[PDB]
Amino acid sequence: SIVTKSIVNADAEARYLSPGELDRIKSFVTSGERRVRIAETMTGARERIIKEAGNQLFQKRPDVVSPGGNAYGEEMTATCLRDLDYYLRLITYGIVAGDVTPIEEIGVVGVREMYKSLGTPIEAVAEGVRAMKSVATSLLSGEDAAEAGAYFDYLIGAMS
Amino acid sequence: SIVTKSIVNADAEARYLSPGELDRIKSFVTSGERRVRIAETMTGARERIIKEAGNQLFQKRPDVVSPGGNAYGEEMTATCLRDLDYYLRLITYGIVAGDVTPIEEIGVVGVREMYKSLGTPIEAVAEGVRAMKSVATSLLSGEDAAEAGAYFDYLIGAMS
Amino acid sequence: SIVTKSIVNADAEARYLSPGELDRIKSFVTSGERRVRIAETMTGARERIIKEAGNQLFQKRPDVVSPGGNAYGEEMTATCLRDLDYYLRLITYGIVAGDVTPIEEIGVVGVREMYKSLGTPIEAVAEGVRAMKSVATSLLSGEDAAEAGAYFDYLIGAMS
Amino acid sequence: SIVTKSIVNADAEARYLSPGELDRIKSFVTSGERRVRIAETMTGARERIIKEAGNQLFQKRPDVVSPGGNAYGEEMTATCLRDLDYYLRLITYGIVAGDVTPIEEIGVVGVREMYKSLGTPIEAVAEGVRAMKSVATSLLSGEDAAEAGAYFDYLIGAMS
Amino acid sequence: RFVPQEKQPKAGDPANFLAMAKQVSRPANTVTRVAL
Amino acid sequence: IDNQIKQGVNKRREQSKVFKLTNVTDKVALQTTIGAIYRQIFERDIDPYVTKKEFTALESKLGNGEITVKEFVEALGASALYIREFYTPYPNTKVIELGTKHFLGRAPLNQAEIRKYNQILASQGLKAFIGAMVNSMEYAQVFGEDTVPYRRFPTLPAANFPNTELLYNQLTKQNDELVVPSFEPVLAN
Amino acid sequence: EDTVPYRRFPTLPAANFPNTELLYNQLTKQNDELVVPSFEPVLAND
Amino acid sequence: RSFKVTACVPSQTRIRTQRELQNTYFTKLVPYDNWFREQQRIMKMGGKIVKVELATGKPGTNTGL
Amino acid sequence: MQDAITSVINSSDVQGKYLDASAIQKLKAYFATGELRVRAATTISANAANIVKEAVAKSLLYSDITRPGGNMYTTRRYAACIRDLDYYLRYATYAMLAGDPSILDERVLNGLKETYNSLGVPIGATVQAIQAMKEVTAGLVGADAGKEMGIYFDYICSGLS
Amino acid sequence: MQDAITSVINSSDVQGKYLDASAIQKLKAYFATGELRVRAATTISANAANIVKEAVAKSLLYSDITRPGGNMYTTRRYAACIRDLDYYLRYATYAMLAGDPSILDERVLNGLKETYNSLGVPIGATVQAIQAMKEVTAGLVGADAGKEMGIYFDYICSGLS
Amino acid sequence: MQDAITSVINSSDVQGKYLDASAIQKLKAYFATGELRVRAATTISANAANIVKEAVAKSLLYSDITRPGGNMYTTRRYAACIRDLDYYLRYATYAMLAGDPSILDERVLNGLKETYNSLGVPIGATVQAIQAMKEVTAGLVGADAGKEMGIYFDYICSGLS
Amino acid sequence: MQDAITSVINSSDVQGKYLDASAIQKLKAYFATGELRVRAATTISANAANIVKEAVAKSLLYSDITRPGGNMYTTRRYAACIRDLDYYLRYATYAMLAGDPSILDERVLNGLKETYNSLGVPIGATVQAIQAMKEVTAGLVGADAGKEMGIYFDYICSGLS
Numbered sequence A, B, C, D: 001s002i003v004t005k006s007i008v009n010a011d012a013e014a015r016y017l018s019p020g021e022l023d024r025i026k027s028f029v030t031s032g033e034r035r036v037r038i039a040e041t042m043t044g045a046r047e048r049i050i051k052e053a054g055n056q057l058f059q060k061r062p063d064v065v066s067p068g069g070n071a072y073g074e075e076m077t078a079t080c081l082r083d084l085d086y087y088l089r090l091i092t093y094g095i096v097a098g099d100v101t102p103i104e105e106i107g108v109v110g111v112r113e114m115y116k117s118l119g120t121p122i123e124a125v126a127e128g129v130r131a132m133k134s135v136a137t138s139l140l141s142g143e144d145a146a147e148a149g150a151y152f153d154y155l156i157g158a159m160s
Numbered sequence E: 001r002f003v004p005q006e007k008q009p010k011a012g013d014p015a016n017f018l019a020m021a022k023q024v025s026r027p028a029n030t031v032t033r034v035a036l
Numbered sequence F: 001i002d003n004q005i006k007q008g009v010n011k012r013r014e015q016s017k018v019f020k021l022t023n024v025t026d027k028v029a030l031q032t033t034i035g036a037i038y039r040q041i042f043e044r045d046i047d048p049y050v051t052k053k054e055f056t057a058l059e060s061k062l063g064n065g066e067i068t069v070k071e072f073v074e075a076l077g078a079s080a081l082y083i084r085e086f087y088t089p090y091p092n093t094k095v096i097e098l099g100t101k102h103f104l105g106r107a108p109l110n111q112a113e114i115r116k117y118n119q120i121l122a123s124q125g126l127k128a129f130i131g132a133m134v135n136s137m138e139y140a141q142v143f144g145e146d147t148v149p150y151r152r153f154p155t156l157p158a159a160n161f162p163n164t165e166l167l168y169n170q171l172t173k174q175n176d177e178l179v180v181p182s183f184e185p186v187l188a189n
Numbered sequence G: 001e002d003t004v005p006y007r008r009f010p011t012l013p014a015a016n017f018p019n020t021e022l023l024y025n026q027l028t029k030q031n032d033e034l035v036v037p038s039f040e041p042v043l044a045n046d
Numbered sequence H: 001r002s003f004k005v006t007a008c009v010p011s012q013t014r015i016r017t018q019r020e021l022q023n024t025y026f027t028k029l030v031p032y033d034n035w036f037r038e039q040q041r042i043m044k045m046g047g048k049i050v051k052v053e054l055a056t057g058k059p060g061t062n063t064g065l
Numbered sequence I, J, K, L: 001m002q003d004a005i006t007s008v009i010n011s012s013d014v015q016g017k018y019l020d021a022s023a024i025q026k027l028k029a030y031f032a033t034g035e036l037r038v039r040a041a042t043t044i045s046a047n048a049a050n051i052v053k054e055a056v057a058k059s060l061l062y063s064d065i066t067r068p069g070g071n072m073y074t075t076r077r078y079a080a081c082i083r084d085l086d087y088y089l090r091y092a093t094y095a096m097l098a099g100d101p102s103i104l105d106e107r108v109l110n111g112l113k114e115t116y117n118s119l120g121v122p123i124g125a126t127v128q129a130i131q132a133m134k135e136v137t138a139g140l141v142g143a144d145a146g147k148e149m150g151i152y153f154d155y156i157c158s159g160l161s
Ligand SMILES: *[C@H](C)[C@H]1/C(=C/c2[nH]c(/C=C3N=C(/C=C4\NC(=O)C(CC)=C4C)C(C)=C/3CCC(=O)O)c(CCC(=O)O)c2C)NC(=O)[C@@H]1C
Pocket: F044, F171, F172, F173, L065, L071, L072, L076, L077, L080, L081, L082, L084, L085, L087, L107, L108, L112, L115, L119, L121, L122, L125, L126
């Protein structure tokens, strides 16, 4: 994580890592006990978030809800509802990791060539996780939502 | 500073700043009032490190002030104190920047050519920063000198 | 005066008098009796200024009074006093008209090549006005001594 | 030289060099080494001409070394040996050149507003070359003082 | 020690420095009387 | 001298030597090639710009033979010393005329070769930009995988020649301005 | 003293000709930059 | 992650006075993302590869690169 | 490139001094604004393709240049104008996090007066673009947060002119 | 880039129109010269090495330039000058087969004036050689293709001088 | 290459499902030990030349391997032999800060089985050189942190011979 | 790049003549003094870190220029100036063994005046270091070679000033 993001940065310049990094890694571990609190809030909400936001993108975009869209059918509306379960379960690894190196390689790298092969609109899932972001700030206590909500904001700004 | 390392790390990606890098400024600026409440005493107590740096060097390295050594007699105990007075500032300059990269571009990155040529041993100036390390940690509190002591220790590893 | 100064640019572009020029003509008719008043202060302090400000010129510049310069004895210093009592009158003639052009068309336009063709250093006349500066501000209230002090101000910068 | 002067007359007339002007060039190079023989009397005794003029400068104009003048003290009086040797080196350039075109390029065209901004008197320079005229021609032969005295008179003419 | 020790292309005064008296003028000198 | 040195091939194109790497188990022949990589990629000495010898890990992988010089030119220019020296204080159209100076040893070829790398440099960083140059075909037959890049003197594209001696007669950091902004379109569309 | 000034075409000074058609082929307010900054000194000191 | 490739390739267009054994036979370490391009470059000269087992190891992993 | 907090550093070190009291106060003006700057940094990064998405529609689209005859009509040239306007937004984000125009004149202002004249692309439409980018970035970060954003935009469009 | 068929295409493209009646007969004017440009380009390509070796003997030999000090003195430079002239022939047969002289500004006359001024090549001896080359290749293609070949040398010949 | 942090993340996706409370306790066991293993990194980054100096001076500075014959006779075969030692010490800091011995498998221990054999290099000197190097770090970082780095340091011994 | 062998053998080439008796006295002058040059060449390289050391102690060090505000205060560049002063030392020896200042035009004075004013380094302080280096060399090698090596030192001071 923030170890391995920094360790590969220290190895690329071939040296012992900075004391600027030493205040980074010390603050991560001493704030990790509330960082695991954010992950267990998503355990009991794992049906509550995805039930509202998939319908919220269906009313933000009713392009999809008609025959001729991409989620249209009981295996096809279950396609995007399950992929929204994946992206929630993706970045909850990255809350307690504290940076983007778990989310980016197994979520973000091959996307644009995949979704054009899958026929899905990239702008749909871009505003779909925007619907996932807004309810995540409500159940948490503001500031800890604000440090974990930026990984949502990483995921919005890296599709398109 | 801590921003400037992340800026060229952003442009080598040529992307935006990832939120693994954003919070490391959020830990920096809210402790920025804390960090300026560290080094200003080291600007304040100026002489007290310096006169306790030379005499704490000369008992651990007495062959420097012998005849034949570079530093010898008068006017060559003061410029070795004044070249040591230079490297006192950059410890404070690394603290208020929150990173060791302004120490490099004015004070580290060309030491192995100019101290090769001048004949001053780079190990012997490294022990002087190790001599002035103990007198600066006493002037600060113990959890405050623990981060500032590593700022010495990078220059230790850069000299040695 | 100001009525000629407001028209000589205006008639050169062949137009009536601008609204932003008549107000200075208007406010001079409100505030020109102070210029009547401070002219009468300079008449009563006519010889009173240069009994020590001329001495203040010889205090800071004893170059000219020595054998070798220009001023020798009583007479030659008296003609310097006559030239400097030609000079306090000219600014007193200039404050009652309220411009630089009463000062300009008598003494300032030919100030340079006369004095280079006389042996008089043109820098040395400026300290006598600089000694006339500190007494004329001090003999007046500081409200009126600003703007009448501002009328020596062009007369300083056109010597050197 | 005449060659960089008679060309500039002939280029402005857009003609060839007229053979009346060629005999000025033809009589130049045969009388050239006699003009060179003037110059080693100048640059040989060039430490003696500056000493014989400068005290004679400060007997004719003894007032620049007065306190509160322009050049009093050890450092400012020592400029005037360099400020006269600058003209002494320029004059012996011209007798070698045969004409005035080194002097008017180097020392003449901005002599006023440099010295007027410095506050130095012009006529003290004008007697300083005039002190240097009679000293150098007394070291010079009877025909040679007539020709080389005229180049001194241009530098008096430069200030006039 | 320190001692930079360079060269130069100016100076070398042979000191002279004669000096003088400096007397003040009484504030009454006839401003008016100069000539004809 | 006007007919001597001033004939049009400025005689250092065909008397400057190149460096091969046939001798990977030789050690002193390796050391003057590694300096030749340093004096062509960064093209100064790298001695006053490094806190400590920095690349001596992957310098030591060379000579052991499990990397090549095409490895060693690519990963060195990808490192953070090339970012600090040649990527930060210059525009990303200067970098295209600076990356082609050291790697591949020429000017940019066409207007489209500016468009090719600026397509790359906006999407990915210098990471995939430096992978796009040395793994191209034009690196492969004129340099090869055993040679250092060197300054070479093209003849076939029109603006390829005089933009090299407006790139190489300058020294390093001589001008902040880029020498060729782009290539001129000759007509409407 | 009876003629209007007009655009004239010099020949005798060297840089006088091509700095006129770098002054007249431009229209008015065509460039904010001055066309010739100054003239080049050719050697060390003159 | 990286591979340990070895391959053989001749050049067709020219006859070279230098030796080129290291140019006609490789044993290179190449990383994972250059290998999508580095393998294709030997196809254009038509050279054969032989042993392409990875040296960095850990296949089939998801994260950790 | 250098930080605003390192602008305090090198200017006090060309004079050879230490951190003095007003030079502490130069950092203290930074440390009251930095926590808003990083809160502004998230919304511009998440909407990096959702600021230019509205901006080109707000000023550039359905005009002469998107029609044939103009410049933006061919898809190669439209692919650069989406690229260059994303490019200025990323470097203005670097201007806001550093608090400096020092990154802009190094990179995006050295050749920009010359690369745009050589390609024939109009400078004045870019002046309309980033001023419209200045308006559309304030609508989603806030006029309190867009004001510190709205300094270096005027540093950009001055350098175009 | 710019062809002759593309020239009437790109003029029709920036208007946004289609193939109009005047745009078709100009496009059919290129096809009416279609047998001339193909047959002449086969003739020059078969006689490339003989039309060069007459053109250097017609103008360049037995002068100052083939003597010591001249720019085609040595065996590097006289072998270079044949190749540097042969690109003027081969690209002129590109411009005939294109039917438009804008292939010369893209790939011949771009930095060519900047090279030869920096190299000490006599431009007026080059433009004398191409002008001698234009006459001798008009006798090999006939008077019909000799006008169309004779244009495209003097688009090169005015780009040099 | 992965740490102990993304060890449990990589096992979470091979099993596919979200990580449960036993996997949570494996992750937060790092956090009880995270603040002390960074305290080892403070003092090991300072004196990194000191650890590799006296470990030579323990048993490798007056030795038969340093006298004619051997493998540290010349200064160049010296210049790798000390260069391997801080490379083990740097990557031991890389191992002990991440909890995983998998970092130095592919970066250090990839070719060390056969490159020390093919070059005629004694491993039995370097295995002797590191067990004295292991004991001096635990005195310098403290016994609370020196134990846990040793099992990443004795991990190097299992891959060496 | 040329040589006193080659510059008198190429200038006689470009005139078209052969080895003239006036041209034969320059080669035999170079063949007479060539044994003096090659013993003078080795003594520079044996003292190359000490000619540069005594130059900066006699001209550069302990002044305002190494005091903050001067250009030498950054130790990035005091490493670079010893690198810069090494360049004039080795290229003077290359001008000495060639007997020719022609390498200094093409490899030192190509664009050297523009790149020093682009950084704002002092011109005369470097010229004062060349005046330091010419007397240190003439003492260490003997005055018969220092009176020839210093000629190419004055060729550097002519181009730098
Ligand atoms: C040092 C005696 C003076 C000085 C120097 C200063 N120099 C810097 C140096 C540069 N020097 C060069 C020069 C050459 N490169 C070459 O290849 C050759 C011929 C073989 C020469 C003569 C160049 C190209 C640079 C700048 C490029 C770079 O940054 O590497 C700097 C460095 C620029 C910077 O911003 O760091 C400084 C101060 N100042 C003094 O005090 C001495 C007078």
